[PDB]
């Protein structure tokens, strides 16, 4: 395996590991802030217990979240030195702004929240978590904005003298269509993940308390948490559909190859049908979807084929294979779309059971709650895999309505490293991250099975 493939695999593995924990933090921090402010406003002990309980899980997830994110900061230079030079002038500014704007805020104020429980006044301590809640959201915007430049490079021009992309206006870079649409979608995904996590943990504990460890105090505490999590999950899903529709609008007119990759269109077609299974065979097709995802119209659109775009791209740029990994993008898109059923289905059932003050006591409900926690994480991971592997030939996709010279293939963005040197790094990160992820899952299980701790039963 050449160095390019190993570097791609290393980046993909080290980033997928990082984003297994990011969705929880981004979505959970607003939820914890909401619970804490509810406690402050209503001085209800129940909300205090939930904040301490879910606070521990949030801190456990936060620690590894920061640990996995450190590598990504340096990976660009380590493996993609050639690509860093090309986009560094314009790419670094969003990254540097994030460090000063978000990292310094969330990292500093998370420490205050953890240790300032009995030191800072309630009002100030409440603001600490809110600052973290805003900081994480801002962190997403700048980072997603940086990637959105690679997907749709605007606001920069190619300088032949230096042979690199140079910035022209930061306002244009931070307000391009992809950054807005991408950010408003990922945040919705993180909110869905956090809401599903809270609902599943709470609902599982509701059933547990009802059938075992019988205690009225604990069940009366979790029911509000279950309802809040379910409502957040439903609200996030409604946001995902709207943002998802918007993303389809841009993808069709920005990266036609990626759109033709979601549904593997061999040749250009009018009103293409959406097929769920392929081995092409096109098992169980679904019309009216692709045209709507393209321009929100049931009919009256032509989608360029994979083959048709190949000739056009070859003529426009040069001899090269511009076909992405059709299988991987196809199935990642299918999984990401199809994983909405679980959390949405779970939310509806959970709300119905808890209707009118009732408390569920069905064993199968606990199993459904447990089986639903993985689904948001897998869906979030699949989406990022699709958008990234959907532009496989390019690391900076050419802009159809921009500077055509602002483009870079992956092979030209990889650093000149020996295969052996990179291979050890891939093994080092894979094993370490796997062990840390296993320990993180075990810690979450251990803390969930314990629920409210005895020494967090009184705000004092």
């Amino acid at each position: 395996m050449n160095v390019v493939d190993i570097s791609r695999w290393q980046f993909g593995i080290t980033t997928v590991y990082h984003f297994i924990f990011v969705p929880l933090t981004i979505g959970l921090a607003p939820l914890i802030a909401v619970m804490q402010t509810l406690w402050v406003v209503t001085d209800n002990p129940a909300w205090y217990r939930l904040t301490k309980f879910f606070g521990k899980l949030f801190l456990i997830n936060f620690a590894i979240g920061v640990a996995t994110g450190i590598v990504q900061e340096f990976q660009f230079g380590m493996n993609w030195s050639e690509y860093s030079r090309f986009v560094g002038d314009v790419f670094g500014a969003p990254l540097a702004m994030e460090g000063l704007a978000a990292f310094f805020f969330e990292s500093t104020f998370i420490g205050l929240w953890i240790f300032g429980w009995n030191r800072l006044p309630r009002l100030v301590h409440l603001a600490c978590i809110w600052i973290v809640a805003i900081a994480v959201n801002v962190s997403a915007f700048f980072i997603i904005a940086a990637n959105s430049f690679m997907q749709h490079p605007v606001g920069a021009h190619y300088n032949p003298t230096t042979g690199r992309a140079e910035l022209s206006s930061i306002v244009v870079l931070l307000t391009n269509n992809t950054a807005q649409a991408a950010f408003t979608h990922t945040v919705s995904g993180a909110l869905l993940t956090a809401g599903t996590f809270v609902a599943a943990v709470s609902a599982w504990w509701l059933v547990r308390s009802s059938t075992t460890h019988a205690d009225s105090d604990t069940q009366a505490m979790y029911r509000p948490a279950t309802i809040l999590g379910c409502w957040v999950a439903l609200a996030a899903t409604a946001g995902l559909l709207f943002t998802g529709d918007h993303q389809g609008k841009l993808m069709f007119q920005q990266q036609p190859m990626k759109m033709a990759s979601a549904e593997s269109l061999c040749d250009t077609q009018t009103d293409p049908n959406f097929s769920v299974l392929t081995v092409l065979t096109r098992v169980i097709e679904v019309p009216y979807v692709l045209p709507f995802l393209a321009e929100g119209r049931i009919s009256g659109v032509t989608l360029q084929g994979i083959r048709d775009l190949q000739q056009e791209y070859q003529q426009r740029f040069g001899p090269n294979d511009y076909r992405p990994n059709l299988f991987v993008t196809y199935w990642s898109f299918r999984m990401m779309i199809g994983l909405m059923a679980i959390p949405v289905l779970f939310a509806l059932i959970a709300l119905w059971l808890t209707r009118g003050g009732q408390i569920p006591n069905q064993r199968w409900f606990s199993w459904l709650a447990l089986l639903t926690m993985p689904a948001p994480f897998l869906a979030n991971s699949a989406g990022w895999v699709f958008t990234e592997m959907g532009r496989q030939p390019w690391v900076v996709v050419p802009n159809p309505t921009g500077d055509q010279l602002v483009r870079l293939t992956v092979k030209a963005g990889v650093s000149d490293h020996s295969a052996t040197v990179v291979a050890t790094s891939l093994l080092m990160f894979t094993l370490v991250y796997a062990v840390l992820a296993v320990i993180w899952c075990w810690l979450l299980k251990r803390y969930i099975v314990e629920g409210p701790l005895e020494h967090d039963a009184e705000p004092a």
């Binding site: 560094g88 670094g92 000063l100 990292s107 251990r446």
Partner: protein, 346 residues
């Protein structure tokens, strides 16, 4: 133009803050194991007391290195690409240590098990010994230079990384942080733990002075500038005062101050000796990277200046407030009993 030198200094300032803050973070991590083996009473209480000094501020301090790397990427893409890709192997170990430390600190007390805590202790120790040693080595390489051809590649070799000068850089940085951490604990705690921290500083006071003086003097003689002599002079003067204070326990704050200046002086000394170039080329000075050819466009630097000019003052504004909030000394009698859960679920 001016912006290039201004942002070179800013990047130097970010690293100056990183070592000023993370300097004692590593030192505390370095010294945890010695405290357990030397301190009286149960070992566990001393480890928790030492760790909790940096408990609320370690996360905020580490961001400086992340922000430093992002700033290097944004202002000097050429510096970012050439260096990090050239230092791939040394930087890999630093990343491994940082990864282990981040999870270990937060997860140490999550479970009550001697084997569990032993594993976390290794994560913190391995996450402080490696960054402390290698960051000294890494900056030694930059000052010494790397083999850079006309095109811009490196083609590094083992002698260019593990050289006598670079090794002295690692030992000096590791020793300096160890002393820096020892005085920090002596300022942040009270009771027998403070006495033990002072005892550690005494042992590290003289050996570190030889290393830092030797490392600083060597750099000043070889790659130093005319004005860098003052930076070395103040470092020697600061170290002399620092050593006296630890030996004669008259003030905890001043001892921390004098050691802090030494760390600051060392960082300024390296950058001062590295002002014009960013990656001096051993093969030929002409091909060496320079701020005047490896920097971003004027517009990018101008935009970045406004953001930093308003956020850097703000970041320092409330970062100091965080330290002020937790200024109260902690001691073995204020540490709450462990809250971890048994490994075997009942």
């Amino acid at each position: 133009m001016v912006l290039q030198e201004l942002w070179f200094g800013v990047i130097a300032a970010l690293f100056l803050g990183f070592f000023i803050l993370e300097g004692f973070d590593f030192g505390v991590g370095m010294l945890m194991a010695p405290f357990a083996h030397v301190g009286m009473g149960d070992p566990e209480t001393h480890r928790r007391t030492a760790l909790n000094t940096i408990g609320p501020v370690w996360d905020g301090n580490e961001v400086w290195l992340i922000t430093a790397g992002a700033a290097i990427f944004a202002a000097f893409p050429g510096w970012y690409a050439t260096v990090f890709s050239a230092l791939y192997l040394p930087l890999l170990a630093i990343l491994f240590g940082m990864i282990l430390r981040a999870v270990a600190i937060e997860w140490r007390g999550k479970i009550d098990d001697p084997k569990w805590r032993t594993g976390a202790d290794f994560g913190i120790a391995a996450g402080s010994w490696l960054p402390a040693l290698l960051w000294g080595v890494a900056f030694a390489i930059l000052v010494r230079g790397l083999p850079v051809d006309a095109n811009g590649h490196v083609a590094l070799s083992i002698p260019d990384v593990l050289n006598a000068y670079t090794l002295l850089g690692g030992l000096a940085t590791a020793g300096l942080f160890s002393l820096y951490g020892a005085v920090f604990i002596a300022l942040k705690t009270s009771g027998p733990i403070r006495d033990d921290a002072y005892r550690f500083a005494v042992w590290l006071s003289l050996p570190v002075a030889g290393l830092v003086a030797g490392f600083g003097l060597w750099t000043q003689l070889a790659y130093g500038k005319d004005w860098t002599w003052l930076v070395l002079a103040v470092a020697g003067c600061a170290q002399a005062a620092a050593t006296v204070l630890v030996w004669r326990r008259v003030s905890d704050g001043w001892a921390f101050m004098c050691t802090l200046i030494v760390v600051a002086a060392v960082v300024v000394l390296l950058f001062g000796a590295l002002y014009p170039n960013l990656v001096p080329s051993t093969l030929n000075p002409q091909w060496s990277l320079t701020i005047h050819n490896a920097s971003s466009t004027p517009y990018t630097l101008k935009i970045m200046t406004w953001v930093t000019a308003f956020f850097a003052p703000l970041t320092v504004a409330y970062q100091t407030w965080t330290y002020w909030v937790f200024r109260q000394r902690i001691s073995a009698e204020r540490i709450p009993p462990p809250t971890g859960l048994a490994r075997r679920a009942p």
